[PDB]
């Protein structure tokens, strides 16, 4: 019987997590929920799952929630603010914390769950993109157990030995028999587009949410998954490669010393890796029909060409350059993408802008959230500057 | 290493034995050969003894053993030489040996294999007949001494690697269901006649498909793997499926309760599963070229056509009928295949011969190697008669 705190409960990952709980009531108890300002949805979740605690992002939201709950005679205690969220992430009786507050704003609560020794289900990506060293050092310090919920990281996790799975990101891949992690992805809608057509890609062509569309066409999404993966799995540059797999049947793979490659497959569904993570080392049922091998297309593979995906190369370079570089790249990219979606720059200008920012860098390695914030803001400025000027 | 693993290799001069030595040769600080067992191949045994200096070697008879000792003497070896079944069984059970490569083929391989298991060893299983013929006996003995079994064959190895750790550690006597396992997926290529029109089957010559070739041409190989797989993994009929995968990049896979699948992939290099099994639970390098994903083509999947592959269905039937039936099936098939190879019967006869023998016998479930052997002879003989018609 697991006690849960869910950080970022009203969003998509929040609801999927709650969905698993709803299907497995004897396995999972919700102790605490933390959300932003969506009072209507948070009330509905508190009324269904009876948490002991709830926290909103601000006092005004908390007060409206307190009213809604009190009308139903609920027992739930309501708080607000970042400190409250951190406290709920560290409660004694809690076994499992879903860290799904998005953006850099998600760092402090994530880090509080990690600092409390909890099983942490990692749904926040900036933690590792921007201050991986601080996060993974805190992991080793507290022995916290990380479990990735995004499909690729979750497939690498399942393709690894228990020994590494239970010592996530602070055990040696090599000593434990791992030769290299194989991070896979589809290559986006432009995997076969003639290179000459890239300069003409429009927002509507990349877009048929919107920013994630663009990140998956540039492979920035894969680049970010790459950097988080070097931190999550304690891998060097030589211990990871990226392979294209158009059909998205394999989710990712792991090569071992003797030649063996273990791979995880399954029909694409958000809930599956969440449910794997939450139930681990048990398994519980899915909604979706099991993958049928007579109905998958043939499975194919390639190597990503840097001419076609220069952002990928850029994210690797940024990775090897350090955390200030990846913080900056991440921030720069957000600006680039909106600028593209706002028809201000060409599709092909994204890498250029991003590279300019990354290579213009000369700041120290960040060692806290505060220093990450500084770099993030500087990088948005320079990126915006670099945009305006062409 | 101060935790070197000591090895007994049974059937040291076969191809599995030599590949096992290759992994030793690549990791000389991790593995030490303590004993080698072979049959009649005196020259080969000697080259291996002179390379790895085992404490002991056995041959299958005294003529073999005496001449081996002569060459070992000429070259100044400290290897003590023995012969006979008893010797092999003792070599399989030395106190200081951690693991036994059980690679003696045929029913001849059962005594030594059983001796390793009973000594609670890490047993690297490379003898089909052990589980096809007396599964119940071998598995009861595994549970009873807690021996750790490690499938060496491609597909069984792939399945082992794709299963939860808790299953791996209690291999053969743990619950698939309780560990989130839903289904074992046994894959195979379909062999050379996967796409031959059925009406040409009757005309297939021994060439177009060596017992080995034929076995995978009929997919008797896979049905055999299927029976062994039921014992090895403690799977019911409903917990195992067969899938055709022509390119054989995926070596086999496991479905879990959440619908997710784990597969092991690699290249055809037999050192992969051997090094896996030998290093277990650690891993080692052994010179294997990492699968290159630019060079694999499209991977494709399909269900086996029992019309094209009747043997498979027969193997499943035999399995459901019990150990006498599967023992009979194994034996019938040897006689059957040789009869196809010797230009005495249609390719297309092999199954009917096999099913006829399997279906014509009044047997009792064997409960010892000896009774296994009795069903084997009986069944070989019946097969001989069926052929005369
Ligand atoms: Mg992803
Ligand atoms: Mg020793
Ligand atoms: Mg095989």
Curated annotation (Swiss-Prot), chain A:
Binding residue positions for Mn(2+): 150, 152, 225
Protein name: 1-deoxy-D-xylulose 5-phosphate reductoisomerase
A biological process term (GO) from this entry: isopentenyl diphosphate biosynthetic process, methylerythritol 4-phosphate pathway involved in terpenoid biosynthetic process
Co-factor(s): Mg(2+); Mn(2+)
Enzyme class: oxidoreductase
Gene this chain is encoded by: dxr
Database matches in InterPro entries: DXP_reductoisomerase (IPR003821), DXP_reductoisomerase_C (IPR013644), DXP_reductoisomerase_N (IPR013512), DXPR_C (IPR026877), DXPR_C_sf (IPR036169), NAD(P)-bd_dom_sf (IPR036291)
EC number, UniProt record: 1.1.1.267
Protein's job: Catalyzes the NADPH-dependent rearrangement and reduction of 1-deoxy-D-xylulose-5-phosphate (DXP) to 2-C-methyl-D-erythritol 4-phosphate (MEP).
Pathway: Isoprenoid biosynthesis; isopentenyl diphosphate biosynthesis via DXP pathway; isopentenyl diphosphate from 1-deoxy-D-xylulose 5-phosphate: step 1/6
Keywords: Isoprene biosynthesis, Manganese, Metal-binding, NADP, Oxidoreductase
Superkingdom to which the source organism belongs: Bacteria
Residues bound to NADPH: 10-13, 36-38, 124, 126, 209
Pfam family, one: DXPR_C
Positions contributing to 1-deoxy-D-xylulose 5-phosphate binding: 125, 151-152, 186, 216, 221-222, 225
Origin species: Yersinia pseudotuberculosis serotype O:3 (strain YPIII)
Family classification: Belongs to the DXR family.
Keyword Ion transport: no
Subunit record text: Homodimer.
One GO MF term attached to the UniProt entry: 1-deoxy-D-xylulose-5-phosphate reductoisomerase activity
Reaction(s) the record says it catalyses: 2-C-methyl-D-erythritol 4-phosphate + NADP(+) = 1-deoxy-D-xylulose 5-phosphate + NADPH + H(+)
